[PDB]
Amino acid sequence: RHRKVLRDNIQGITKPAIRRLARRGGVKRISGLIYEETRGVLKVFLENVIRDAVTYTEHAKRKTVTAMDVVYALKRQGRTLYGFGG
Amino acid sequence: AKRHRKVLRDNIQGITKPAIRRLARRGGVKRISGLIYEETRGVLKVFLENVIRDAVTYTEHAKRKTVTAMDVVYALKRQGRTLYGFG
Amino acid sequence: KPHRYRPGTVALREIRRYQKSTELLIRKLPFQRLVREIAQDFKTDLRFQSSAVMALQEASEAYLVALFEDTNLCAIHAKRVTIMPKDIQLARRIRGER
Amino acid sequence: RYRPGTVALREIRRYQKSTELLIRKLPFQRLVREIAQDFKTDLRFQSSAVMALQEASEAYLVALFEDTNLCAIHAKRVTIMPKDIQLARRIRGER
Amino acid sequence: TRKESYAIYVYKVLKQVHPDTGISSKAMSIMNSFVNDVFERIAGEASRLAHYNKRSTITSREIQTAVRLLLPGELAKHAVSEGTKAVTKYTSA
Amino acid sequence: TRKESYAIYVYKVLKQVHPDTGISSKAMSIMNSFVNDVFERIAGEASRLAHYNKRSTITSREIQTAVRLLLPGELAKHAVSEGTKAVTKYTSA
Amino acid sequence: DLEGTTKRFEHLLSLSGLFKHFIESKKFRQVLDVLEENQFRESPAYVNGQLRPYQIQGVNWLVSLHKNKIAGILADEMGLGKTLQTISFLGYLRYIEKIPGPFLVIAPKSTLNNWLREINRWTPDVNAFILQGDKEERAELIQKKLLGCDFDVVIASYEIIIREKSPLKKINWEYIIIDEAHRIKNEESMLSQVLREFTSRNRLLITGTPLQNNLHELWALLNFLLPDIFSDAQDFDDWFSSESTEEDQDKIVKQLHTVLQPFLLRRIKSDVETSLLPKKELNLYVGMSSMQKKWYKKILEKDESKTRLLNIMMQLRKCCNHPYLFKGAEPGPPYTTDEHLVYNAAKLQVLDKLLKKLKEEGSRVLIFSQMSRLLDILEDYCYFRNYEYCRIDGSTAHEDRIQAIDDYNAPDSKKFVFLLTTRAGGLGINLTSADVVVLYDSDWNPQADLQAMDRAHRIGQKKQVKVFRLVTDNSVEEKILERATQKLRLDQLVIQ
Amino acid sequence: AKAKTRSSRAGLQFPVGRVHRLLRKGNYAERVGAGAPVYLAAVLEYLTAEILELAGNAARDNKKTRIIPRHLQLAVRNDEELNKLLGRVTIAQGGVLPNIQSVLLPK
Amino acid sequence: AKAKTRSSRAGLQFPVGRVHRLLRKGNYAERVGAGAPVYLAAVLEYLTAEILELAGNAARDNKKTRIIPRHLQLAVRNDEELNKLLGRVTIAQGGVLPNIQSVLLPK
DNA sequence: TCGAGAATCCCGGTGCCGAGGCCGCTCAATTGGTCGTAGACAGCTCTAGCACCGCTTAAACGCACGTACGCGCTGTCCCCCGCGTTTTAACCGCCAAGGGGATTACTCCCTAGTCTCCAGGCACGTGTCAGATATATACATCCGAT
DNA sequence: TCAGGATGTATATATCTGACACGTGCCTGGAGACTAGGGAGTAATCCCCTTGGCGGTTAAAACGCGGGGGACAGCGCGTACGTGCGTTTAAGCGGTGCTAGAGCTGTCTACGACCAATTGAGCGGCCTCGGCACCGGGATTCTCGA
Ligand SMILES: Nc1ncnc2c1ncn2[C@@H]1O[C@H](COP(=O)(O)OP(=O)(O)O)[C@@H](O)[C@H]1O
Incomplete structure (x- = not known):
């Protein structure tokens, strides 16, 4: 219930993290312009699924985004996730 | 002798080379190779085979012997290709 | 000399003429025989209402048009203008189908 | 020193064999709270909500890079670019 | 022989938007199939949304949430406005 | 407080497939979610398959057609075989 | 329009009064009560040759139907000369009545060349086409020559007449002569629907044989002869009960010896004879x-x-x-x-x-x-x-x-x-x-x-x-x- | 004691009684509300009027007075948010809206 | 009268009364049959036994007794038809099966 | 660097067939009135989320090399386009049967309810061994040259 | 072509820990016994799909040919990611409060279900008249050459 307003918000997703995440995908020779683009497309994905999860949270008149709300947002989004109940 | 029905150009070959030619012109492509045609007949045969299997399942459930248009609509909707106009 | 066009002018004129149109594009009786041939295997002696064959033809026409449009995007990514089998199978390897 | 291209294949063989969660949990926490501040204010979260959301986004982005690698090797290269990572999510049905 | 359809209502909405434009028959069938689709999406989503809270009935708050959740962006704002306007005018009478 | 979880049935099937292999709790949770997903797919498809025929009850033939329609190819034949075997043993005894 | 309608109804009743069975019991009962209170056997040489005496017998039956202003059916056997009886009736309107046109004959495509050979072989003074060719060439055969009104007889096919219904509504016809008329054995055929859309004065009909399967075939042949007389599907089958298929008393078929004879002329093999030999089976x-x-x-x-x-x-x-x-x-x-x-x-x-x-x-x-x-x-x-x-x-x-x-x-x-x-x-x-x-x-x-x-x-x-x-x-x-x-x-x- | 349709109490065209009966008999939940069919009828009003108004403008473009499936195709997929709703659905007799890739036409 | 469960009449391990109650109270249709919960119990038996048998083989392959979600991941996406069923779902803590493209590694 | 020449769009005219109107009926909406019972609100409890702070150390970052891959440029074939001429298969019409899919309509049996006892499985405490770190033994594989 | 480090694999002692079993309370699964509706199953009516052939028409399809612009190997070269190494630095673990609010129970009504009269909106059937499709013809205009 406090606010430690810390800057440098989105690009805490660092480039060695994103490069490991690409090496799992099977890639070899990453360019230098992948990074800002991949932060953009991750933000787009996360926007959509959090919008739906907070809609499901707000409907049942609560304040805590649970895990089941996120599973339902992913369920109707197209991509089901097993492992977290439901 | 020649008294048999074995001498006939088979049935996927009715999808002629200019038909796929026109069908790619609507898609907006300028220059087409010579090996598109057989692969496209393969792709169409795969797609129709899945859809017509789902349609014959929906018919054979209801104890009919004739495929309706609502049948094909339900198959294409279940697969994720919903078709407006015939429902 | 007679009057010919450059290679490619007729192609763009055809593209304009079919994107402006709305007709049904691969013919009817060969497609009829293809549907009967493709469904003889799953169960013998079915019958087809003609609106069902029209529905199946319109759906396959729309699908195959969207596939060629995606293949054209992939070919123009490869710095060419011709489409090939390589990108007509990449464009549905990348789709989720193969 | 190694030849440039050996350590990369060793990292491919390492990170495809493990299963750990791969980007760090506290900056992802701050990213989710920063990006969910906009819709409703001052919410709560469980821990398992942030874990679910991280695991989903990670698997999404891994599959995206695999498809981008195919779409890069199609143009006869070995380097991914912005062009093919936006071709892939154009041709997927997302753009 | 009796078949029900959303035909005459689409014609009424056409004639209170465009006072002179007509609709064909194929387009009438295509928009009948459209409104069947959108009805089935919204009602099927509100079903499972009411199931997720162990709540038996389906009410206007469920349709509220489902239309906010199902159709995108700037369109949801106007749809919510139209729905609440109709519900207030209905309960006033 | 009461929570139903499919866990002991999965453990019984595990003890009669591999009689010595154990399972962690994360895998048990993930397979709980698997059977709920597959159950909801088959039941939700058989419901609309019964709605298309203007028939009110859901029956064995609906589940027959749904599990034939839903899970792909060669895997459907053995599932149909298991289902008919169980139903005939149930009605016979 | 009721000038010949008086001449038709009175000539129906000019014979044995079985015609009154349904005309009294039918707009077409209006003009009934208005009216209820009320040769050439020399082989005429305007043709280029001879006419057989049985051919003369058929031609006189045609001018019988012509003067009394009613239609008919010429259903004789092939080889007897159905064409030559037809041509000589046309020259009767060129050498006796002298009505120079128009004329329209319709035949199968296989016979069309045999007509215009046979026209000039017997009446050489006739101006007649055979309307052939494609969508290009038929335009000159319409615009340059059929619109030029420089013809007497038009010889079309069964299927060009379907493609060309629009330039033939402009001309009002004195005659329509349909040859080999097994095409109008159906009443709901595409060809018969086009035929009623024309305008005619007379309507002739030449076939090989009448009905093959049902009684329902024959009246549709006669419906498009004279539709003012029947115009009815219930009233012909039910009056006759479909070929007396229930009793075989053969007294309902006495009525066929009263109805068909003012419209039909069918002749037997025993005329000449054709093959000059009877056969077996x-x-x-x-x-x-x-x-x-x-x-x-x-x-x-x-x-x-x-x-x-x-x-x-x-x-x-x-x-x-x-x-x-x-x-x-x-x-x-x-x-x-x-x-x-x-x-x-x-x-x-x-x-x-x-x-x-x-x-x-x-x-x-x-x-x-x-x-x-x-x-x-x-x-x-x-x-x-x-x-x-x-x-x-x-x-x-x-x-x-x-x-x-x-x-x-x-x-x-x-x-x-x-x-x-x-x-x-x-x-x-x-x-x-x-x-x-x-x-x-x-x-x-x-x-x-x-x-x-x-x-x-x-x-x-x-x-x-x-x-x-x-x-x-x-x-x-x-x-x-x-x-x-x-x-x-x-x-x-x-x-x- | 004289009837009044509750499609008119809300001031709509779509039938509230029909959508209430259909939402009941289509076994969506065990009990159905009172404001729920009214809310659905309103959102169907708005969506149908919106797609059909864009269709009317696209039909008026081509000097027509009667609308065609081609006009509904150009009404949907030349829009953005309505394209986002109807992205997965094909339309009969629709065709493709015109486009040619830019590095393909000659210069 | 001694109560005998009908998970034993059909001879199954999955419950039949539970799936009957859940199928009823999840408002799928308005009436249910008698053979439907038995049939669903049988097909859930078959699917669970099949995926768990492949996971057991893949666990014994890495010389481990107790199974991991990684083993479920390998057993799911190493088959073909069971990959075709679950092709759109992800899995928690699962990872990716090893493959590198062919013309990338040196030769 | 502006002329020839073919393609396309824009003018009239006919004509035809489907979209808009009206009419009758009939059956789903609508009204009015009980009647059980979901959900609405109030209140209490206890739990998991939030904010601190300190300590350790993997991990990110910013710097320098340096080679290898992206990219423009160059011939060189060679395969697909554009147009002209046969040729054949769609596309209508037509024959002549017959047959399967929709409406009443009527009478069994299947399933849902309802009350009633017992046992199944779920939570909650104990109390043991498979997985993991760890860690020093020996172990198989790319990298300047020759 | 062979020695040289830095990698990946048996390998055995050595802890924590979490899965597996055992033993207790209570919630729902079921046995059963009566009822009522739904769906099966015969039984007429009629109308669109099917087979195996005729006939004609006429745009599409098939084929062929010359030729030209695109795909495609080589080839040079110049930045630009890869690798490694010091140097910060912030994530991670481990305690320690502190309280917002998730969740559960208790009454107790507003409100849907359900029912029978009743009666106006909507659905088939009819006609009918302009909106659109089509056809010469004419003007414009885009693409091919100097
Ligand atoms: N008096 C006659 N003298 C010679 N030939 C005749 C005579 N009458 C008829 N014919 C021949 O009969 C032929 C007519 O054949 P026809 O029976 O009318 O054929 P269809 O039965 O197909 O109409 C003519 O070619 C003509 O030569």
Whole structure:
């Protein structure tokens, strides 16, 4: 219930993290312009699924985004996730 | 002798080379190779085979012997290709 | 000399003429025989209402048009203008189908 | 020193064999709270909500890079670019 | 022989938007199939949304949430406005 | 407080497939979610398959057609075989 | 418009008063109560030649219908000159009444060249076209010449008249003469719907025979003669109760000796005679071989077979004809040309016996079938017996249909048999050089067989004609044959 | 004691009684509300009017007075948010809206 | 009268009364049959036994007794038809099966 | 660097057939009135989320090399386009049967309810061994040269 | 072509820990017994799909040929990611409060279900008249050459 307003918000997703995440995908020779683009497309994905999860949270008149709300947002989004109940 | 029905150009070959030619012109492509045609007949045969299997399942459930248009609509909707106009 | 066009002018004129149109594009009786041939295997002696064959033809026409449009995007990514089998199978390897 | 291209294949063989969660949990926490501040204010979260959301986004982005690698090797290269990572999510049905 | 359809209502909405434009028959069938689709999406989503809270009935708050959740962006704002306007005018009478 | 979880049935099937292999709790949770997903797919498809025929009850033939329609190819034949075997043993005894 | 309507109704009632049976009990009852209170036997030489006295007899029947302003049906036999009676009636409106046009005749495409030969051969002073050609060339044949009004007689086809209904509404017709009119045996055909959209003064009609299947066919022929008289479907079938199919008291058919005679003129073979020789007909009831006895049970009782059972009367028709049409009754590859082929068809066993008796006599035969695939079996069997032949059939050609006839009608032609199908080649061909003609199966139209029986039995036939019908014992065909036998006495005993 | 349709109490065209009966008999939940069919009828009003108004403008473009499936195709997929709704659905007799890739036409 | 469960009449391990109650109270249709919960119990038996048998083989392959979600991941996406069923779902803590493209690694 | 020449769009005219109107009926909406019972609100409890702070150390970052891959440029074939001429198969019409899919309509049996006892499985405490770190033994594989 | 480090694999002692079993309370699964509706199953009516053939028309399809612009190997070269190494630095673990609010129970009504009268909106059937499709013809205009 406090606010430690810390800057440098989105690009805490660092480039060695994103490069490991690409090496799992099977890639070899990453360019230098992948990074800002991949932060953009991750933000787009996360926007959509959090919008739906907070809609499901707000409907049942609560304040805590649970895990089941996120599973339902992913369920109707197209991509089901097993492992977290439901 | 020649008294048999074995001498006939088979049935996927009715999808002629200019038909796929026109069908790619609507898609907006300028220059087409010579090996598109057989692969496209393969792709169409795969797609129709899945859809017509789902349609014959929906018919054979209801104890009919004739495929309706609502049948094909339900198959294409279940697969994720919903078709407006015939429902 | 007679009057010919450059290679490619007729192609763009055809593209304009079919994107402006709305007709049904691969013919009817060969497609009829293809549907009967493709469904003889799953169960013998079915019958087809003609609106069902029209529905199946319109759906396959729309699908195959969207596939060629995606293949054209992939070919123009490869710095060419011709489409090939390589990108007509990449464009549905990348789709989720193969 | 190694030849440039050996350590990369060793990292491919390492990170495809493990299963750990791969980007760090506290900056992802701050990213989710920063990006969910906009819709409703001052919410709560469980821990398992942030874990679910991280695991989903990670698997999404891994599959995206695999498809981008195919779409890069199609143009006869070995380097991914912005062009093919936006071709892939154009041709997927997302753009 | 009796078949029900959303035909005459689409014609009424056409004639209170465009006072002179007509609709064909194929387009009438295509928009009948459209409104069947959108009805089935919204009602099927509100079903499972009411199931997720162990709540038996389906009410206007469920349709509220489902239309906010199902159709995108700037369109949801106007749809919510139209729905609440109709519900207030209905309960006033 | 009461929570139903499919866990002991999965453990019984595990003890009669591999009689010595154990399972962690994360895998048990993930397979709980698997059977709920597959159950909801088959039941939700058989419901609309019964709605298309203007028939009110859901029956064995609906589940027959749904599990034939839903899970792909060669895997459907053995599932149909298991289902008919169980139903005939149930009605016979 | 009621000027001839008075002349038509009074000439209906100018004969025996059975016409009052329905006219009193029908707008068309309005003009009834308005009116209820109220030759040339010299062979006229405006034609270029002679007219036979029976031809004079028909022409006088036409001007009978002309002066009294009513229509008719000329349903005589071919070879008697239906064309020459028709042409001389037109010159009556050029040399006696002198009405120079217009005229429209409609015929099948195969006969159109024979008309304009026959016009100038007898009335050379007639200006007449044959409207042929494509969408380019027909425009000059309309705009430059038909719109130029420089014609008397227009000779069209059955199918160009469907494409060209719009430039022919501009001309009001004095005559419409429809030849070979089995096309309007349906009332709901596309051609008949176009015909009522025209305008006419007179409406003639020339066919070979009347109805083949039902009474319902014949009134639709007469509905488009004079629609003011009938215009009714309920009132013609129910008044007659469909061919007296319930009692055979043969007193309702006395009414056919009152109704048909003001409109019909059909004449018998005994006029000249045409072939100058009467003919015979036999039925050869043959059994089934043991192989095709299985296939009759493989279809119904559902027993190697693996057969689709879509058309019952057609799948079983192949079994009654020949087993090897089912493509699975054949022994597997490699395919052998062998005598077990004819062993499994009882008809071929007789046919092997029948051709041996007639090879000595040299009686060259004509063989008909309803299926071209069964001619393909006889295509190989005549080689396997080393018999020369030709095959005129559908999908051969048009130019091939000229030559192989001229092979068979050539003197000392060494061709043993000659193959044809039934409804294909009735186009006025000459095959009188053959003396015997056999069939293979029955047909739902008995006159389609009977018109095919006069392939060789026409003018120029000198030897005796025998007809042998291969009938399968206790099978599908003995139902079809008796149903075909039932329809044959029908139009026989109405007319004769 | 004289009837009044509750499609008119809300001031709509779509039938509230029909959508209430259909949402009941289509076994969506065990009990159905009172404001729920009214809310659905309103959102169907708005969506149908919106797609059909864009269709009317696209039909008026081509000097027509009667609308065609071609006009509904150009009404949907030339829009953005309505394209986002109807992205997965094909339309009969629709065709493709015109486009040619820019580095393909000659210069 | 001694109560005998009908998971034993059909001879199954999955419950039949539970799936009957859940199928009823999840408002799928308005009436249910008697053979439907038995049939669903049988097909859930078959699917669970099949995926768990492949996971058991893949666990014994890495010389481990107790199974991991990684082993479920390998057993799911190493088959073909069971990959075709679950092709759109992800899995928690699962990872990716090893493959490198062919013309990338040196030779 | 502006002329020839073919393609396309824009003008009239006919004509035809489907979209808009009206009419009758009939059956789902609508009204009015009980009647059980979901959900609405109030209140209490206890739990998991939030904010601190300190300590350790993997991990990110910013710097320098340095080679290898992206990219423009160059011939060089060679395969697909554009147009002209046969040729064939769609596309209508037509024959002649027959047959499977929709409406009443009527009478069994299947399933849902309802009350009633017992046992199944779920939560909650104990109390043991498979997985993991760890860690020093020996172990198989790319990298300047020759 | 062979020695040289830095990698990946048996390998055995050595802890924590979490899965597996055992033993207790209570919630729902079921046995059963009566009722009522739904759906099966015969039984007429009629109308669109099927087979195996005729006939004609006429745009599409098939083929062929010359030729030209695109795909495609080589080839040079110049930045630009890869690798490694010091140097910060912030994530991670481990305690320690502290309280917002998730969740559960208790009454107790507003409100849907359900029912029978009743009666106006909507659905088939009819006609009918302009909106659009089509056809010469004419003007414009885009693409091919100097
Ligand atoms: N008096 C006659 N003298 C010579 N030939 C005649 C005479 N009358 C008719 N014909 C011949 O009869 C032929 C007419 O054939 P027709 O029986 O009318 O054919 P269709 O029956 O097909 O109309 C003409 O070619 C003509 O030569």
